[PDB]
Structures are given as C-alpha cells and as structure tokens.
C-alpha cells in the first residue's frame, strides 16, 4: 500500500521526538525553580508526540484495510 510506508516513517520520527522529550523531562526533574519552564515544555512536548502517535496510528489502521 502507498501510504503505509510514509505513515510508518512519521511514526519513527514522532517516536524519536517522544524519546527526546522523555529524556528532557528526566533531566529537568531535579526540581530547580530555574528549569521549571523547560520541564513544563518538555512535558507538553511529550504529550503532543504521544497524541500525534495515537492519531497517525488511527490513520495507519485505516490504511491496513484493503
């Protein structure tokens, strides 16, 4: 199928992004008042990537019907 490969690539990318975000969150969890904003940003990014994975995966499950 045409779109499958592309969807999987998007998956690899967003997964990499998710990994990165997780590592950021882990690094800034020291709890310093200075890293607060960086930590929150890292969180929002993690959540974003996960949601995108959910959506792209819905689309992918659709693409696997043929």
């Amino acid at each position: 199928l045409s779109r499958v490969a592309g969807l999987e690539k998007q998956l690899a990318i967003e997964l990499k992004v998710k990994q990165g975000a997780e590592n950021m969150i882990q690094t800034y969890s020291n709890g310093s008042t200075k890293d607060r904003k960086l930590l929150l940003t890292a969180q929002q990014m993690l959540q974003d990537s996960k949601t995108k994975i959910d959506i792209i995966r819905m689309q992918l499950r659709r693409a696997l019907q043929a």
Binding site: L11, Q47, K50, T51, I53, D54, R57, R61, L64
Partner: protein, 233 residues
C-alpha cells in the same frame, strides 16, 4: 448547602479564575435544579473543583485544566472523562457503579482499585508504570502511551486492547474473544501461545517490536494455518 458550597467555591476563585468558576457553577446549578445528568466543566483554567459535585449526575466531563486532584465522586456516576491536566497524578476512589473511565493526557502515576462493573477503561499518555487487577466485565482497554513494562491478567470479555508505545517485555494470556490487539513499539521478544486461539477476524498489530526469528517464523506458520491478519516489524 450545595449552592452555598458552590458559592463559597466561586468567591474563593484565584485571580483570573472567576468567570470560569461562575460558568461551572451555572452548569452545576443546571444539573441540580433541572436534573441535567451530565456535568461538563469545560476548560476554565480551573485550579480546583468544589468539595462536592451534584449528587444525581450520571456523567462527568473534565477537559484541560489545572486540577491537582478531584473531589469525591457521586455514587451514581456512570461515566468519567478526565483529560489535559498535567498536574493531576491521582484519581479519587472510584464509585462502584462506574462503567466508563476515560482518563488520559494527564500525569497519573497510578490508578485506584477499579470498580467491577467497569466495561471501558482508557488511560493513555499518563505516567503509569503499573496497572491494578482488571475488572472482569471490561471489554475495552487502552493503556497506550505509558511506562508500562507489563500487563496484569486480562478479562474473558475484553474485545479490544491497546498497549502500544510502552516498555512491555511480555504479554499475558489472551481470551479467544479478543477482536483487536495493538501492541506496538514495545520490548516484546516473545508472544503467548493463546494468540493462536484468536478469531481469524482479529486485527493484531505487532509492529515496532524486537520479536525474533523463531517468533517471526512462528507467526508466518500461524498465518499460513489460520488466515488471521498480523503485522511484522
């Protein structure tokens, strides 16, 4: 009492949070006086909810907010949806008669023991590293987007399972009545024998896992003998 508690809660609004709380209060008074079964607080930027919700509401919807915690829930609550609260790491004890629990895109570290009647559980994009025992009546389970390294025993009535995007090393045994299983981007190098007992109409996505040559050829043989659709990656 109720209206007094809600009024107090409104006057106690933090700076900038007044209009939102007033709206929520309108909603709650609607539920109370007009018997509206559903309470939707919307996204008000709420940092807190009143000590007590309307008693007779069946369904509760909490969108993106600042909530650190939830108040004790009404005994007759059938459905609960909590989403978009990054500082909410914990749910309150859940009413036994609860059917649908959708709590996702939050910070939850753990879940409280789940009510037996629960048939639909979606907790995704949370911090969960573990799950409690599963209610026997649960037909739909979405745990994806978590830290889970494993799943507990699955109920005989489960029609759907999404474990994808986790740390899972191993899947548990599965009931033949499972329609859809998506486990992706996990650590599984192996799969449970019960997988063979599934219906040929089952949709199983294994992509994103190490698996193994033995497991891969096992899957190919199983496909040859069955005709069920499976994913390899």
């Amino acid at each position: 009492e109720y209206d007094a508690v809600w009024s107090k809660w409104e006057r106690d609004a933090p700076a900038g949070e007044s209009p939102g709380r007033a709206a929520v209060v309108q909603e709650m008074r609607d539920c109370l006086n007009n018997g509206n079964p559903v309470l939707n607080v919307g996204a008000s930027g709420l940092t807190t909810l009143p000590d007590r919700l309307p008693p007779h509401i069946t369904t509760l919807v909490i969108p993106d907010n600042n909530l650190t915690s939830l108040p004790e829930l009404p005994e007759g609550l059938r459905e609960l949806e909590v989403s978009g609260n990054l500082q909410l790491t914990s749910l309150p004890s859940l009413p036994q008669g609860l059917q649908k629990l959708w709590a996702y895109n939050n910070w939850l570290a753990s879940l409280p023991t789940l009510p037996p009647g629960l048939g639909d559980l979606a907790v995704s994009n949370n911090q969960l590293t573990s799950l409690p025992e599963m209610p026997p009546a649960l037909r739909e389970l979405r745990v994806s987007g978590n830290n889970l390294t494993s799943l507990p025993a699955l109920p005989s009535g489960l029609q759907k399972l999404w474990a994808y995007n986790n740390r899972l090393t191993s899947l548990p045994e599965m009931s033949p009545g499972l329609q859809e299983l998506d486990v992706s981007h996990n650590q599984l190098t192996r799969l449970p024998q019960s997988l063979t007992g599934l219906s040929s109409a089952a949709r199983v996505y294994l992509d994103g896992n190490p698996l193994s040559v033995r497991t891969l050829q096992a899957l190919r043989d199983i496909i040859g003998h069955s005709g069920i659709r499976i994913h390899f990656d």
